[PDB]
Design a protein around this ligand. Sequence first.
Ligand SMILES: Cc1cc2nc3c(=O)[nH]c(=O)nc-3n(C[C@H](O)[C@H](O)[C@H](O)COP(=O)(O)OP(=O)(O)OC[C@H]3O[C@@H](n4cnc5c(N)ncnc54)[C@H](O)[C@@H]3O)c2cc1C
Ligand SMILES: Cc1cc2nc3c(=O)[nH]c(=O)nc-3n(C[C@H](O)[C@H](O)[C@H](O)COP(=O)(O)OP(=O)(O)OC[C@H]3O[C@@H](n4cnc5c(N)ncnc54)[C@H](O)[C@@H]3O)c2cc1C
Ligand SMILES: CC[n+]1c(-c2ccccc2)c2cc(N)ccc2c2ccc(N)cc21
Ligand SMILES: CC[n+]1c(-c2ccccc2)c2cc(N)ccc2c2ccc(N)cc21
Ligand SMILES: CC[n+]1c(-c2ccccc2)c2cc(N)ccc2c2ccc(N)cc21
Ligand SMILES: [Zn+2]
Ligand SMILES: [Zn+2]
Lengths: 230, 230
Amino acid sequence: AGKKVLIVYAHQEPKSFNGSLKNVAVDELSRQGCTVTVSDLYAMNFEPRATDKDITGTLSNPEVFNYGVETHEAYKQRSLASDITDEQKKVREADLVIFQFPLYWFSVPAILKGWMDRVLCQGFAFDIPGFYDSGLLQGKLALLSVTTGGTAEMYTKTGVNGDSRYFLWPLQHGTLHFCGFKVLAPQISFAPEIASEEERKGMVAAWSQRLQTIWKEEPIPCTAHWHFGQ
Amino acid sequence: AGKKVLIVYAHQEPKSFNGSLKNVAVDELSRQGCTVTVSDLYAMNFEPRATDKDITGTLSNPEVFNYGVETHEAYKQRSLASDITDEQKKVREADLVIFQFPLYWFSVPAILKGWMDRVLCQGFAFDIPGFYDSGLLQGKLALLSVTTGGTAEMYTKTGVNGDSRYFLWPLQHGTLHFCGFKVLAPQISFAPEIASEEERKGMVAAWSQRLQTIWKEEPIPCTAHWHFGQ
Ligand SMILES: Cc1cc2nc3c(=O)[nH]c(=O)nc-3n(C[C@H](O)[C@H](O)[C@H](O)COP(=O)(O)OP(=O)(O)OC[C@H]3O[C@@H](n4cnc5c(N)ncnc54)[C@H](O)[C@@H]3O)c2cc1C
Ligand SMILES: Cc1cc2nc3c(=O)[nH]c(=O)nc-3n(C[C@H](O)[C@H](O)[C@H](O)COP(=O)(O)OP(=O)(O)OC[C@H]3O[C@@H](n4cnc5c(N)ncnc54)[C@H](O)[C@@H]3O)c2cc1C
Ligand SMILES: CC[n+]1c(-c2ccccc2)c2cc(N)ccc2c2ccc(N)cc21
Ligand SMILES: CC[n+]1c(-c2ccccc2)c2cc(N)ccc2c2ccc(N)cc21
Ligand SMILES: CC[n+]1c(-c2ccccc2)c2cc(N)ccc2c2ccc(N)cc21
Ligand SMILES: [Zn+2]
Ligand SMILES: [Zn+2]
């Protein structure tokens, strides 16, 4: 009992398929008695740019600004901007982080990329040492819930788009695994725009049904073999 | 017939290693007699977020906002935000587009991701049909000039990050090839922060040197096999 979930949500439109997937997650996890928080990035006008405004007070080397170094140092000295530390608190408290987003150029929308760039700073999400299996968010679960324009068929190994697992690598391995997350199997809702109403409802139902047993899941082996291998 | 180059540059600090790579590109291409334009995204405070502010005309569906549909229609009608069409002019006139950036989470910094999201809209960069080899930017070249924190060794098949080509897939194939670009081989400058002053100087020089004969290069086969092997 007592699980905490953060949903990081990146869609402009409440009535969208993404919005529906987010709301189903909120309702079902809430029904289960979980603690639920939603970071609605567009509604928050979330800042995507990594800039020197992300550090308050004086820099550790204001002659040559290195964002990575400066945010590492600011994290240690508790002088990060409040929009960042607000998100870090939600992540720190969460047992599971769900990312809900439409696929933009085989990746996350820029507003969500900005969340990953700015929130997951050195000292908070990883360090030397402490990355991949020993990343600082170890013990936490992460799950990518992505919607696509392309159909399942268009996303095969030999297809024009390649296997969907190919585009997952930078997100699941390079970002989430790197920070110590155990990665649950992605939820891929293929081509809702093209799908019939029945097919759309079926995809929503699949998600809702999955959420009923999400705490019983095993994480994937987040390896190059899982992503590219046979 | 001389050549036109656009450099889309994503770093906050002029004195950075990325800044030096951008400046030597400008120096060398200028020396050759090329026409050179730089989009300095951080200096321009470039807007990364995909929002309804990107359309200024009457929305096709003002009760349910679909970013892709609305920007496609706005492109055709000429009612996109002018920061978008300003970038589109630079791309349209370019023979070669160089992207200069530090790797953020196996990808581009969010401010540059936003450039891709917002600038490469339907009708301008691709059509349905009219993508990959029939993409609308066919005839143009693109090149990623990337810097990393991780070492070359970490970015190998047996290294913990996997091969560097793995993370290039969403950018080179999912984005640039999809829009019709032919893709020149990536320039990856590994681990400058860790390297010595001389090694750093050497990496900048190697870039400058490659650029001398850039117009003689052939593009890569931007395929799953090139990226992932057999
Ligand atoms: C900049 C950009 C880059 C992109 N890059 C890619 C890419 O690389 N690869 C790719 O494949 N695609 C890409 N796309 C397409 C994009 O991924 C899809 O448009 C997106 O995933 C669709 O999801 P949505 O929530 O916006 O769908 P919506 O348009 O909101 O939903 C589809 C339909 O489902 C309906 N619906 C909503 N809720 C429910 C419900 N509860 N039950 C039943 N029906 C419901 C909606 O009303 C709508 O009619 C890109 C799009 C953009 C704008
Ligand atoms: C949010 C975030 C995510 C990241 N994700 C990843 C990731 O997934 N994978 C990864 O590998 N790395 C990652 N990194 C690390 C990042 O890619 C590196 O920090 C970046 O590439 C370093 O390049 P730079 O231009 O900032 O280096 P700088 O710090 O600017 O350069 C190093 C030194 O070179 C010096 N220099 C400048 N010009 C010259 C010159 N001409 N000759 C000699 N020396 C010169 C500078 O003064 C500086 O001291 C991430 C960093 C951040 C902040
Ligand atoms: C700039 C520090 N730094 C490094 C890094 C760079 C050089 C040497 C050691 C670590 C880094 C290296 C990898 N692979 C992945 C992510 C990051 C990173 C991420 C965020 C941040 N805020 C600083 C970060
Ligand atoms: C038009 C939607 N759409 C699709 C897409 C979805 C289904 C079928 C064909 C293409 C797409 C497919 C791939 N592989 C790569 C990028 C995009 C894309 C990119 C931007 C955008 N604004 C719309 C996009
Ligand atoms: C193991 C690679 N690696 C990293 C490193 C860089 C990015 C992410 C993780 C580690 C490193 C990071 C810092 N700050 C300082 C020295 C080293 C280093 C030094 C020697 C070596 N042989 C590998 C090294
Ligand atoms: Zn992994
Ligand atoms: Zn390709």
